[PDB]
Amino acid sequence: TICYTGDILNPERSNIYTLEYYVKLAKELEREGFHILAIKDMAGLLKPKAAYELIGELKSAVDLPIHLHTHDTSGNGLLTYKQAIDAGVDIIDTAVASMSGLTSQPSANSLYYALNGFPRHLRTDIEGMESLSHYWSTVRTYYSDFESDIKSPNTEIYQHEMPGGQYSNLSQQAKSLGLGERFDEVKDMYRR
C-alpha cells in the first residue's frame, strides 16, 4: 500500500510526492511480490482528477489490481471514487450509508446509484444494503457518547493534511494548552 500525501495536481505542492514517485513506488511493490496494490489515502487528499491520473497511470505501469481507499473528509470522496472507477479501478473501500460520510469511507449505498448511467456497475445488493443501513443507523445511536465533533465537510485538510480525526483531536488538545482560540497558527504550524 502506497500511503498518499500532498497533491499530484499542483506542480509546486511537493518536489517529492509527485506522480512518478507513486509509480516508482508501485513497481517496487510488484517487484517485491505483493498480489494487490492498494492506495491508502488516509486524509482525503486525493482530489477527483488526481485520482483519475494517479490510477490511470499505475493501471498501466503495474500489472496488479488496484485497491482504493479514501475518507470523505472533504466531501469529495465519492467524486474521487467515480473518477478512479472511470480510470480503471478494481476495488474501492466503502461503508454502509448510515455509517458513512465525513471521516468515514464514502457512502456505498450512494455510489451504487451514482454509477447509474456510466459504463461500470458497483457489484452489490442495494436492497440488502438499504436494510444494513437501517440497522446500523440505529445501533449507531448507542454510541452517541463517542461521535466526533466533525459535522460537515472540512476542505482545509488540503492544507495541513491531518488524517482521520486529527483536526478534531488536535483542537481538543490545543485548548488544553492555552492555544485553542489561536488554532489558526496550529493549522499553520502543523502545515509548516
* DSSP letter (8 states) at residue 142: G
- Provide the minimum distance between the beta carbon of 53 and a copy of itself in the complex, in angstroms, as a whole number: 8
Q: Between residues 42 and 46, which has the closer beta carbon with respect to Mn ion?
A: 42
- Provide the minimum distance between the beta carbon of 146 and a copy of itself in the complex, in angstroms, as a whole number: 11
Give backbone dihedrals phi and psi of 69, rounded to 5 degrees, phi first.
Answer: -150, 130
Q: Which of these ranges, 39-47, 48-56, 169-177, 181-189, lies near Mn ion under the rule CB under 5 A?
A: 39-47
Return the exposure string of 85-115: e unless at least 16 CB atoms fall within 10 Å of the residue's CB, then b: bbbebbebbbbbbbbbbbbbbbbbbebbebb
Distances, alpha carbon 43 to alpha carbons 14, 59, 89, 113, 172, in Å: 16, 22, 19, 25, 19
- Provide the minimum distance between the beta carbon of 47 and a copy of itself in the complex, in angstroms, as a whole number: 5
Q: Which of these ranges, 17-25, 36-44, 50-58, 80-88, lies near Mn ion under the rule CB under 5 A?
A: 36-44
Pairwise CA distance, residues 63 & 61, whole Å:
7
135 binds, among Mn ion, a copy of itself, none (CB under 5 to 8 A by kind): none
Site residues for a copy of itself, 161-180, by CB under 8 A, read none
Pairwise CA distance, residues 45 & 176, whole Å:
28
Instruction: For residue 71, give the C-alpha cell.
Output: 475518507
For binding to a copy of itself (CB under 8 A), which residues are involved?
9, 47-50, 52-53, 74-76, 78-79, 82, 97-101, 106-107, 109-110, 112-114, 116-118, 126, 130, 133, 137, 140, 151-156, 158, 181
